[PDB]
Short mmCIF file of all heavy atoms in Angstrom, two decimals:
data_model
loop_
_atom_site.label_atom_id
_atom_site.label_comp_id
_atom_site.label_asym_id
_atom_site.label_seq_id
_atom_site.Cartn_x
_atom_site.Cartn_y
_atom_site.Cartn_z
N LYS A 1 11.17 -11.38 14.79
CA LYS A 1 9.91 -10.72 14.81
C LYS A 1 9.41 -10.63 16.27
O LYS A 1 9.39 -11.63 17.01
CB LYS A 1 8.83 -11.47 14.00
CG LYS A 1 9.01 -12.95 14.04
CD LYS A 1 8.06 -13.60 13.08
CE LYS A 1 6.61 -13.48 13.51
NZ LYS A 1 5.68 -14.22 12.63
N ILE A 2 8.98 -9.42 16.68
CA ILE A 2 8.29 -9.22 17.98
C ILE A 2 6.83 -8.95 17.68
O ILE A 2 6.45 -7.94 17.12
CB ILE A 2 8.89 -7.99 18.71
CG1 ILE A 2 10.35 -8.29 19.12
CG2 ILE A 2 8.06 -7.72 19.95
CD1 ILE A 2 11.03 -7.21 19.96
N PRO A 3 5.94 -9.93 18.03
CA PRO A 3 4.57 -9.79 17.60
C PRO A 3 3.81 -8.63 18.22
O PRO A 3 4.11 -8.23 19.33
CB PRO A 3 3.95 -11.15 18.07
CG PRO A 3 4.79 -11.57 19.21
CD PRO A 3 6.19 -11.09 18.86
N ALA A 4 2.86 -8.11 17.43
CA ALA A 4 1.95 -7.05 17.91
C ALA A 4 2.73 -5.85 18.40
O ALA A 4 2.42 -5.27 19.44
CB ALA A 4 1.01 -7.58 18.98
N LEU A 5 3.73 -5.42 17.65
CA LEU A 5 4.50 -4.23 18.01
C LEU A 5 4.41 -3.12 16.97
O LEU A 5 4.18 -2.01 17.32
CB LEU A 5 6.00 -4.67 18.20
CG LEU A 5 6.93 -3.51 18.66
CD1 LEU A 5 6.38 -2.81 19.88
CD2 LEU A 5 8.30 -4.05 18.90
N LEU A 6 4.65 -3.44 15.68
CA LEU A 6 4.61 -2.36 14.68
C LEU A 6 3.20 -1.90 14.40
O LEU A 6 2.97 -0.69 14.12
CB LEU A 6 5.23 -2.85 13.36
CG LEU A 6 4.47 -3.73 12.37
CD1 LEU A 6 3.64 -2.95 11.39
CD2 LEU A 6 5.44 -4.68 11.61
N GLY A 7 2.18 -2.78 14.53
CA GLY A 7 0.80 -2.34 14.35
C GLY A 7 0.31 -1.36 15.38
O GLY A 7 -0.40 -0.41 15.11
N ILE A 8 0.79 -1.58 16.63
CA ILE A 8 0.40 -0.66 17.73
C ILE A 8 1.02 0.72 17.46
O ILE A 8 0.36 1.75 17.67
CB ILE A 8 0.82 -1.23 19.10
CG1 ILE A 8 -0.28 -2.21 19.57
CG2 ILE A 8 1.04 -0.14 20.11
CD1 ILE A 8 -0.30 -3.56 18.93
N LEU A 9 2.29 0.75 17.08
CA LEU A 9 2.96 2.01 16.95
C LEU A 9 2.53 2.79 15.72
O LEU A 9 2.39 4.03 15.74
CB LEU A 9 4.51 1.81 16.94
CG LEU A 9 5.07 1.10 18.13
CD1 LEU A 9 6.55 0.78 17.92
CD2 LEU A 9 4.90 1.94 19.40
N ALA A 10 2.34 2.06 14.61
CA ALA A 10 2.08 2.74 13.34
C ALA A 10 0.66 3.26 13.27
O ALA A 10 0.39 4.35 12.74
CB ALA A 10 2.33 1.82 12.19
N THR A 11 -0.31 2.54 13.81
CA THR A 11 -1.70 2.91 13.70
C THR A 11 -2.32 3.39 15.05
O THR A 11 -3.50 3.72 15.07
CB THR A 11 -2.54 1.71 13.17
OG1 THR A 11 -2.50 0.67 14.14
CG2 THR A 11 -1.99 1.23 11.87
N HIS A 12 -1.55 3.37 16.10
CA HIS A 12 -1.95 3.81 17.46
C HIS A 12 -3.12 2.98 18.02
O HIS A 12 -3.68 3.35 19.03
CB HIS A 12 -2.35 5.33 17.50
CG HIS A 12 -1.14 6.22 17.54
ND1 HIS A 12 -1.24 7.59 17.76
CD2 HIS A 12 0.19 5.94 17.44
CE1 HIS A 12 -0.08 8.14 17.81
NE2 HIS A 12 0.81 7.17 17.59
N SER A 13 -3.48 1.87 17.34
CA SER A 13 -4.52 1.03 17.75
C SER A 13 -4.35 -0.33 17.06
O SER A 13 -3.34 -0.60 16.43
CB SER A 13 -5.90 1.61 17.42
OG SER A 13 -6.13 2.85 18.17
N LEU A 14 -5.42 -1.22 17.18
CA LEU A 14 -5.40 -2.50 16.57
C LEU A 14 -6.45 -2.51 15.44
O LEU A 14 -7.12 -1.50 15.19
CB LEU A 14 -5.66 -3.59 17.53
CG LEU A 14 -4.54 -4.02 18.52
CD1 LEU A 14 -4.29 -3.01 19.63
CD2 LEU A 14 -4.74 -5.38 19.06
N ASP A 15 -6.54 -3.65 14.77
CA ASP A 15 -7.51 -3.90 13.66
C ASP A 15 -7.26 -2.89 12.48
O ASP A 15 -8.18 -2.62 11.71
CB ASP A 15 -8.94 -3.77 14.15
CG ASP A 15 -9.24 -4.70 15.28
OD1 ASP A 15 -8.24 -5.32 15.83
OD2 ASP A 15 -10.39 -4.82 15.69
N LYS A 16 -5.99 -2.38 12.38
CA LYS A 16 -5.65 -1.50 11.29
C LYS A 16 -4.42 -2.09 10.60
O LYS A 16 -3.26 -1.74 10.92
CB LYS A 16 -5.39 -0.10 11.78
CG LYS A 16 -6.46 0.44 12.70
CD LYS A 16 -7.82 0.59 11.97
CE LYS A 16 -7.74 1.66 10.90
NZ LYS A 16 -7.52 3.01 11.48
N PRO A 17 -4.62 -2.99 9.65
CA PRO A 17 -3.46 -3.68 9.01
C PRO A 17 -2.58 -2.67 8.23
O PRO A 17 -3.08 -1.69 7.69
CB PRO A 17 -4.11 -4.64 8.06
CG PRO A 17 -5.44 -4.11 7.79
CD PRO A 17 -5.89 -3.38 9.01
N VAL A 18 -1.31 -2.97 8.26
CA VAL A 18 -0.29 -2.14 7.56
C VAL A 18 -0.07 -2.72 6.17
O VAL A 18 0.28 -3.93 6.09
CB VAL A 18 1.00 -2.05 8.34
CG1 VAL A 18 2.07 -1.34 7.55
CG2 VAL A 18 0.79 -1.36 9.68
N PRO A 19 -0.27 -1.98 5.12
CA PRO A 19 -0.08 -2.53 3.77
C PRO A 19 1.33 -3.00 3.49
O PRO A 19 2.30 -2.36 4.03
CB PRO A 19 -0.48 -1.42 2.81
CG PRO A 19 -1.24 -0.44 3.63
CD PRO A 19 -0.65 -0.61 5.04
N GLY A 20 1.52 -4.05 2.69
CA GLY A 20 2.82 -4.50 2.29
C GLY A 20 3.24 -4.03 0.97
O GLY A 20 2.45 -3.38 0.23
N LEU A 21 4.50 -4.27 0.61
CA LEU A 21 5.07 -3.78 -0.68
C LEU A 21 4.34 -4.42 -1.82
O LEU A 21 4.03 -3.75 -2.82
CB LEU A 21 6.52 -4.09 -0.74
CG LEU A 21 7.41 -3.22 0.21
CD1 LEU A 21 8.91 -3.62 0.09
CD2 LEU A 21 7.26 -1.73 -0.17
N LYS A 22 4.04 -5.70 -1.76
CA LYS A 22 3.38 -6.41 -2.87
C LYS A 22 1.92 -5.79 -3.11
O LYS A 22 1.57 -5.52 -4.25
CB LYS A 22 3.22 -7.88 -2.57
CG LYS A 22 4.61 -8.54 -2.35
CD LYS A 22 5.39 -8.61 -3.63
CE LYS A 22 4.71 -9.47 -4.65
NZ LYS A 22 4.57 -10.86 -4.20
N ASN A 23 1.20 -5.54 -2.00
CA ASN A 23 -0.09 -4.94 -2.16
C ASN A 23 0.00 -3.57 -2.70
O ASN A 23 -0.82 -3.12 -3.50
CB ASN A 23 -0.82 -4.93 -0.76
CG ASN A 23 -0.73 -6.26 -0.11
OD1 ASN A 23 0.20 -6.52 0.68
ND2 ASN A 23 -1.66 -7.11 -0.30
N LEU A 24 1.03 -2.77 -2.30
CA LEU A 24 1.21 -1.43 -2.81
C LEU A 24 1.51 -1.46 -4.32
O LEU A 24 0.99 -0.67 -5.08
CB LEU A 24 2.36 -0.73 -2.07
CG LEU A 24 1.98 -0.38 -0.63
CD1 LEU A 24 3.24 -0.13 0.20
CD2 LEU A 24 1.07 0.81 -0.56
N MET A 25 2.32 -2.43 -4.79
CA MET A 25 2.59 -2.54 -6.22
C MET A 25 1.32 -2.90 -6.95
O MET A 25 1.03 -2.32 -8.03
CB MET A 25 3.70 -3.54 -6.43
CG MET A 25 5.05 -3.19 -5.88
SD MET A 25 6.18 -4.49 -5.86
CE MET A 25 6.22 -5.00 -7.60
N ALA A 26 0.57 -3.85 -6.43
CA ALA A 26 -0.71 -4.27 -7.00
C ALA A 26 -1.67 -3.11 -7.15
O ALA A 26 -2.41 -2.99 -8.10
CB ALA A 26 -1.33 -5.41 -6.25
N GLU A 27 -1.72 -2.23 -6.13
CA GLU A 27 -2.57 -1.04 -6.15
C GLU A 27 -2.11 -0.05 -7.14
O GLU A 27 -2.91 0.73 -7.76
CB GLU A 27 -2.72 -0.46 -4.76
CG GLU A 27 -3.66 0.70 -4.67
CD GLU A 27 -3.80 1.30 -3.29
OE1 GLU A 27 -3.25 0.67 -2.32
OE2 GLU A 27 -4.34 2.38 -3.13
N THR A 28 -0.77 0.12 -7.28
CA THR A 28 -0.21 1.09 -8.24
C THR A 28 -0.31 0.66 -9.66
O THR A 28 -0.22 1.52 -10.53
CB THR A 28 1.25 1.41 -7.90
OG1 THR A 28 1.98 0.20 -7.82
CG2 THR A 28 1.37 2.12 -6.58
N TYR A 29 -0.51 -0.61 -9.93
CA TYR A 29 -0.67 -1.10 -11.31
C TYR A 29 -1.82 -0.32 -12.01
O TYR A 29 -1.61 0.20 -13.11
CB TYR A 29 -0.83 -2.60 -11.35
CG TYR A 29 -1.27 -3.14 -12.68
CD1 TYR A 29 -0.38 -3.33 -13.73
CD2 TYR A 29 -2.60 -3.46 -12.89
CE1 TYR A 29 -0.79 -3.83 -14.96
CE2 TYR A 29 -3.02 -4.00 -14.11
CZ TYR A 29 -2.11 -4.14 -15.15
OH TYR A 29 -2.56 -4.66 -16.32
N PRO A 30 -3.06 -0.29 -11.46
CA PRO A 30 -4.06 0.53 -12.14
C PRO A 30 -3.67 2.01 -12.15
O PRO A 30 -4.02 2.67 -13.11
CB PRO A 30 -5.30 0.30 -11.23
CG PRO A 30 -5.11 -0.97 -10.56
CD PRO A 30 -3.63 -1.03 -10.34
N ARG A 31 -2.94 2.47 -11.12
CA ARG A 31 -2.41 3.83 -11.19
C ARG A 31 -1.42 3.99 -12.31
O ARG A 31 -1.35 5.04 -12.92
CB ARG A 31 -1.74 4.18 -9.84
CG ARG A 31 -2.75 4.20 -8.67
CD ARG A 31 -2.03 4.55 -7.38
NE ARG A 31 -1.47 5.87 -7.35
CZ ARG A 31 -2.08 6.97 -6.87
NH1 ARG A 31 -3.28 6.86 -6.35
NH2 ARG A 31 -1.50 8.13 -6.92
N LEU A 32 -0.64 2.93 -12.60
CA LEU A 32 0.24 2.97 -13.75
C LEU A 32 -0.50 3.07 -15.06
O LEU A 32 -0.11 3.81 -15.96
CB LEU A 32 1.15 1.71 -13.77
CG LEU A 32 2.23 1.62 -12.69
CD1 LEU A 32 3.10 0.40 -12.93
CD2 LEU A 32 3.06 2.87 -12.59
N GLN A 33 -1.59 2.30 -15.21
CA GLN A 33 -2.38 2.45 -16.43
C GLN A 33 -2.98 3.85 -16.58
O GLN A 33 -2.91 4.42 -17.66
CB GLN A 33 -3.48 1.38 -16.42
CG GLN A 33 -2.99 -0.03 -16.47
CD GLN A 33 -4.10 -1.03 -16.29
OE1 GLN A 33 -3.98 -2.23 -16.61
NE2 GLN A 33 -5.21 -0.59 -15.68
N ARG A 34 -3.59 4.37 -15.47
CA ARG A 34 -4.12 5.69 -15.50
C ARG A 34 -3.04 6.75 -15.79
O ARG A 34 -3.29 7.73 -16.53
CB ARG A 34 -4.82 6.00 -14.24
CG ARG A 34 -6.02 5.16 -13.97
CD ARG A 34 -6.69 5.54 -12.63
NE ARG A 34 -7.09 6.95 -12.65
CZ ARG A 34 -7.59 7.57 -11.55
NH1 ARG A 34 -7.72 6.91 -10.39
NH2 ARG A 34 -7.90 8.81 -11.67
N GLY A 35 -1.85 6.56 -15.28
CA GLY A 35 -0.70 7.47 -15.60
C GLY A 35 -0.32 7.43 -16.99
O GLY A 35 0.06 8.44 -17.61
N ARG A 36 -0.31 6.22 -17.65
CA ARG A 36 -0.03 6.12 -19.07
C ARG A 36 -1.05 6.91 -19.87
O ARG A 36 -0.70 7.61 -20.79
CB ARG A 36 -0.02 4.65 -19.50
CG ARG A 36 -0.26 4.42 -20.94
CD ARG A 36 -0.40 2.96 -21.29
NE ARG A 36 -0.86 2.74 -22.69
CZ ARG A 36 -2.11 2.67 -23.04
NH1 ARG A 36 -3.13 2.83 -22.18
NH2 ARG A 36 -2.43 2.52 -24.33
N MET A 37 -2.33 6.74 -19.52
CA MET A 37 -3.37 7.49 -20.19
C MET A 37 -3.16 8.98 -20.01
O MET A 37 -3.25 9.79 -20.97
CB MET A 37 -4.76 7.06 -19.70
CG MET A 37 -5.25 5.74 -20.20
SD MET A 37 -6.14 5.80 -21.77
CE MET A 37 -4.75 5.76 -22.98
N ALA A 38 -2.86 9.42 -18.78
CA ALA A 38 -2.66 10.81 -18.51
C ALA A 38 -1.41 11.42 -19.24
O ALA A 38 -1.48 12.52 -19.74
CB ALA A 38 -2.47 11.04 -17.02
N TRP A 39 -0.34 10.60 -19.36
CA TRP A 39 0.82 11.09 -20.07
C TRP A 39 0.55 11.24 -21.57
O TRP A 39 0.98 12.20 -22.20
CB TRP A 39 1.99 10.13 -19.81
CG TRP A 39 3.31 10.69 -20.11
CD1 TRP A 39 4.00 11.60 -19.34
CD2 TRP A 39 4.17 10.43 -21.26
NE1 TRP A 39 5.21 11.87 -19.91
CE2 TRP A 39 5.34 11.18 -21.08
CE3 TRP A 39 4.04 9.61 -22.37
CZ2 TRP A 39 6.36 11.16 -22.01
CZ3 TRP A 39 5.10 9.57 -23.27
CH2 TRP A 39 6.21 10.37 -23.13
N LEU A 40 -0.22 10.28 -22.13
CA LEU A 40 -0.61 10.43 -23.54
C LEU A 40 -1.47 11.65 -23.71
O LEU A 40 -1.23 12.44 -24.67
CB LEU A 40 -1.34 9.15 -23.99
CG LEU A 40 -0.50 7.94 -24.33
CD1 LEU A 40 -1.40 6.75 -24.68
CD2 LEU A 40 0.47 8.29 -25.43
#
């Protein structure tokens, strides 16, 4: 790991955290429920 490198490049600044895979899955879980409703 090289500290303070990907955050600078991805967000062009600081204080902008990059979401992780676990957080993305947790956020998509309500999206999964809404998608089930939409598919029905």
Side-chain angles (χ1 to χ4, degrees):
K1 39 185 290 183
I2 294 184
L5 182 54
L6 79 87
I8 276 77
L9 301 173
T11 65
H12 281 189
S13 294
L14 285 76
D15 306 8
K16 312 297 294 296
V18 173
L21 288 177
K22 303 291 296 299
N23 313 90
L24 291 161
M25 296 167 56
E27 184 182 347
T28 53
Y29 168 81
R31 297 179 64 95
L32 290 185
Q33 296 173 160
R34 296 181 57 187
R36 158 186 171 272
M37 286 272 85
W39 200 75
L40 281 177

